[PDB]
């Protein structure tokens, strides 16, 4: 670290070196901080967490009890020990509270004033953070497994919604049109994720073992269908071209958006070239998931080597994206881990679980 | 409207004449609307469609539904044919040129026989004419003036066959589609029309034809609301618009149903939220 400081100070190394190397070291040193706590407000398991993209100060959390909690992640107290207090909450007494499990919650990108949350009550509600009131509600004919707003589109503000129906709903928050559907899947869409690179690329993963990349502008179906083998087992596309050998319940674009990570109920995680959907043949070993719903997992940002934090049973398995080497397993939960979310500002992790807890993992030293 | 300033457009006026039923025609219509057939229609035991066709036939001319100066299709037994008599005579005295439209080809033939009973020169084109000889007839009508009235149904020929030499147009009977009658009036009044064209729609008041026209206006209003502006003054009643097996002919003491109905004449998450709450309060 002193060599790094001297090399930064004397100009031998770009300061980008010290940032990325030290962030990588902190991520490798990621450990359960009992010196930080998150206030327990959910009566049920936390299904989803979302730290705001701008300023990374506030976090949303949606539980199976239908409540939403809005936490402050900054140590506003002068002590080195603090609890991430719950700023707001859509509780059992809020007139607009979800009737069933909140399965996904997402801050509006580009501004903290709005956030959207979807439930098994077949609703995607848009909330005004300041008034903590719903500004819009999108009812769907079948329960929502996942929703996602594009983190990058300054032009369109579509929410891709995956429900049990075989179609992917696109809901325009700009004046309300929830009619557009992307058809081509055959079973419930368990995960949707916009590319962080292209405004109009949407990756959708479904229980029919297929992941499809769509160009929502295009009127001619999916761009690419992910194939495990890339052509070794080739068939006229009616049942082949499966991304996994089970249900694909999790999607995550890497930071630069040039690759896609999919996790399926075949207990595998695969890394795909997001441009031509080619499997990169990164191993990753066995990634235990048996989730019957969407599995929210994240990647690291702004480190020398990219990492993926995937829920592995009751633990969080940390892998290197481009080599597959399992860095570690963060073990602090008591039940299955449903979601983990990455604070890129300080290389911190927050993980929710069915044990109705949110555990913060902070780098040690 | 926006492109009007680039190309010329002669003014177009349009009237809807309300033609009272003749007493024999009125009796036939009242017998049909009191006969057990319309009662079975109201019971749903029989197809309403045949009753619709029958009442349209009655309002066209009784000889259609029922089946010298007493031959087939005598123009004195239907009020719309009375008005066609008056308009054709006046327009011939004015030296104009007429398009005579009707949805029914049988009543088109009745109108032909009527025109032969008169001394008006005329030319007919309908579905029975061969397509390979359709273009000549139109040309012969458009080039000279020695042909007075051209006979059409609203749906024959290619879309917008060039009938420019006509000056006046009469739509003998309304259709269910607003677009076919709009095309009928548009066919005479196109680009390169030299003189002011006027359209006269012939209706029988208090009958099925008035309700056909009401449905036509309602569909036109729906299309306009969808395509140009949602805010629109509401004209109609749900039950009156849909019930169309009655006969209330005006006695001139009270105004007609149409005139009674038409008696008056990146986002920064706050613009996004403002638009959402605006749309939701409506």
Swiss-Prot record, chain A:
Keywords, in A-Z order: Chromosome, Cockayne syndrome, Deafness, Disease variant, DNA damage, DNA repair, Dwarfism, Nucleus, Phosphoprotein, Repeat, Ubl conjugation pathway, WD repeat
> Is the Repeat keyword given for this protein?
yes
Task: Offer a single GO CC term for the protein.
Answer: Cul4-RING E3 ubiquitin ligase complex
Cellular localisation: Nucleus; Chromosome; Nucleus matrix
UniProt subunit comment: Part of the CSA complex (also named DCX(ERCC8) complex), a DCX E3 ubiquitin-protein ligase complex containing ERCC8, RBX1, DDB1 and CUL4A; the CSA complex interacts with RNA polymerase II; upon UV irradiation it interacts with the COP9 signalosome and preferentially with the hyperphosphorylated form of RNA polymerase II. Interacts with ERCC6/CSB (via CIM motif); promoting recruitment to lesion-stalled RNA polymerase II (Pol II). Interacts with KIAA1530/UVSSA. Interacts with a subunit of RNA polymerase II TFIIH.
Q: Which disease is it linked to?
A: Cockayne syndrome A: A rare disorder characterized by cutaneous sensitivity to sunlight, abnormal and slow growth, cachectic dwarfism, progeroid appearance, progressive pigmentary retinopathy and sensorineural deafness. There is delayed neural development and severe progressive neurologic degeneration resulting in intellectual disability.
Q: What is this protein called?
A: DNA excision repair protein ERCC-8
Q: What is the lineage of its organism?
A: Eukaryota, Metazoa, Chordata, Craniata, Vertebrata
The gene coding this protein: ERCC8
Swiss-Prot record, chain B:
The UniProt annotation puts motif CSA-interacting motif (CIM) at 269-281
Describe PTMs of this protein: Phosphorylation at these two sites promotes the intramolecular interaction of the N-terminal domain with the helicase ATP-binding domain, thereby probably releasing the inhibitory effect of the N-terminal domain on its ATPase activity. Phosphorylation is essential for its chromatin remodeling activity. Ubiquitinated at the C-terminus. Ubiquitination by the CSA complex leads to ERCC6 proteasomal degradation in a UV-dependent manner. Stabilized following interaction with KIAA1530/UVSSA, which promotes recruitment of deubiquitinating enzyme USP7, leading to deubiquitination of ERCC6 thereby preventing UV-induced degradation of ERCC6 by the proteasome.
Highest taxon of the lineage: Eukaryota
What is the annotated localization of this protein? Answer: Nucleus; Chromosome
Q: What does this protein do?
A: Essential factor involved in transcription-coupled nucleotide excision repair (TC-NER), a process during which RNA polymerase II-blocking lesions are rapidly removed from the transcribed strand of active genes. Plays a central role in the initiation of the TC-NER process: specifically recognizes and binds RNA polymerase II stalled at a lesion, and mediates recruitment of ERCC8/CSA, initiating DNA damage excision by TFIIH recruitment.
Could you give the domain comment from the record?
The CSA-interacting motif (CIM) mediates interaction and recruitment of ERCC8/CSA. A C-terminal ubiquitin-binding domain (UBD) is essential for transcription-coupled nucleotide excision repair activity, interaction with RNA polymerase II, association with chromatin after UV irradiation and for mediating the UV-induced translocation of ERRC8 to the nuclear matrix.
Into which family does the record put it?
Belongs to the SNF2/RAD54 helicase family.
Query: Which disease does the UniProt record connect it to?
Result: Cockayne syndrome B: A rare disorder characterized by cutaneous sensitivity to sunlight, abnormal and slow growth, cachectic dwarfism, progeroid appearance, progressive pigmentary retinopathy and sensorineural deafness. There is delayed neural development and severe progressive neurologic degeneration resulting in intellectual disability.
What this protein is called in its record is DNA excision repair protein ERCC-6
């Amino acid at each position: 670290m002193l060599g790094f400081l001297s090399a930064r100070q004397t100009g031998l190394e770009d300061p980008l070196r010290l940032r990325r190397a030290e962030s990588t070291r902190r991520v490798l040193g990621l450990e359960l901080n009992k010196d930080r706590d998150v206030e327990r407000i959910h009566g049920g398991g936390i299904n989803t967490l979302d730290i705001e993209p701008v300023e990374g100060r506030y976090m949303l959390s949606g539980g199976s009890d239908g409540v939403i909690v809005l936490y402050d992640l900054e140590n506003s107290s002068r002590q080195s020990y603090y609890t991430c207090k719950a700023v707001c909450s859509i509780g059992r007494d809020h007139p607009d509270v979800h009737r069933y499990s909140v399965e996904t919650v997402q801050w509006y990108p580009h501004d903290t004033g709005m956030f959207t949350s979807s439930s098994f009550d077949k609703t995607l509600k848009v909330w005004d953070t300041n008034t903590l009131q719903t500004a819009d509600v999108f009812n769907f004919e079948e329960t929502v497994y996942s929703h996602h707003m594009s983190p990058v589109s300054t032009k369109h503000c579509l929410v891709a919604v995956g429900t049990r129906g075989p179609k992917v709903q696109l809901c325009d928050l700009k004046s309300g049109s929830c009619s557009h559907i992307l058809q081509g899947h055959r079973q419930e869409i368990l995960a949707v994720s916009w590319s962080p690179r292209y405004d109009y690329i949407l990756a959708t993963a479904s229980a029919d073992s297929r992941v499809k990349l769509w160009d929502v502008r295009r009127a001619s179906g999916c761009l690419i269908t992910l194939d495990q083998h890339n052509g070794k087992k080739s068939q006229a596309v009616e049942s082949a071209n499966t991304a996994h050998n089970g249900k694909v319940n999790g999607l995550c674009f890497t930071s630069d958006g040039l690759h896609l990570l999919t996790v399926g109920t075949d207990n595998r995680m695969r890394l795909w070239n997001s441009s031509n959907g080619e499997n990169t043949l990164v191993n990753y070993g066995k990634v235990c998931n048996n989730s019957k719903k969407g599995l929210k997992f994240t990647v690291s940002c702004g480190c020398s080597s990219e990492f993926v934090f995937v829920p592995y049973g009751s633990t969080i398995a940390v892998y290197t994206v481009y080599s597959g080497e399992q860095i570690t397993m963060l073990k602090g939960h008591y039940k299955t881990v449903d979601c983990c979310v990455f604070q890129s500002n300080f290389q911190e992790l927050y993980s929710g679980s069915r044990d109705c807890n949110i555990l913060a993992w902070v780098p040690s030293l | 409207s926006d492109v009007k300033m680039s190309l010329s457009l002669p003014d177009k006026n349009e009237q809807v004449l309300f033609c009272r039923l003749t007493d024999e025609q009125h009796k036939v219509y009242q017998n049909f609307v009191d006969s057990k057939e319309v009662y079975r229609i109201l019971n749903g035991e029989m197809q309403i469609f045949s009753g619709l066709i029958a009442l349209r036939k009655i309002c066209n001319h009784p000889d259609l539904f029922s089946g010298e100066e007493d031959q087939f299709g005598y123009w004195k037994r239907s009020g719309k044919m009375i008005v066609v008599e008056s308009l054709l005579k006046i327009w011939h005295k004015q030296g104009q040129r007429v398009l005579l439209f009707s949805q029914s080809r049988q009543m088109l033939d009745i109108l032909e026989v009527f025109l032969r009973a008169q001394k008006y020169t005329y030319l007919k084109m309908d579905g029975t004419t061969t397509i390979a000889s359709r273009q000549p007839l139109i040309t012969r009508y458009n080039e000279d003036t020695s042909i007075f009235v051209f006979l059409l149904t609203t749906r024959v020929g290619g879309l917008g066959v060039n009938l420019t030499g006509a000056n006046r147009v009469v739509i003998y009977d309304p259709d269910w589609n607003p677009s076919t009658d709009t095309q009928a009036r548009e066919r005479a009044w196109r680009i390169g029309q030299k003189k002011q064209v006027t359209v006269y729609r012939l209706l029988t008041a208090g009958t099925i034809e008035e309700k056909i026209y009401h449905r036509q206006i309602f569909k036109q209003f729906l299309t306009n609301r969808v395509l140009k502006d949602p805010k629109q003054r509401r004209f109609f009643k749900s039950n009156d618009l849909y019930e169309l097996f009655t006969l209330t002919s005006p006695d001139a003491s009270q105004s007609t149903e149409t005139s009674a109905i038409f008696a008056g004449t990146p986002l920064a998450s706050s613009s996004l939220l403002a638009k959402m709450r605006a749309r939701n309060h409506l």
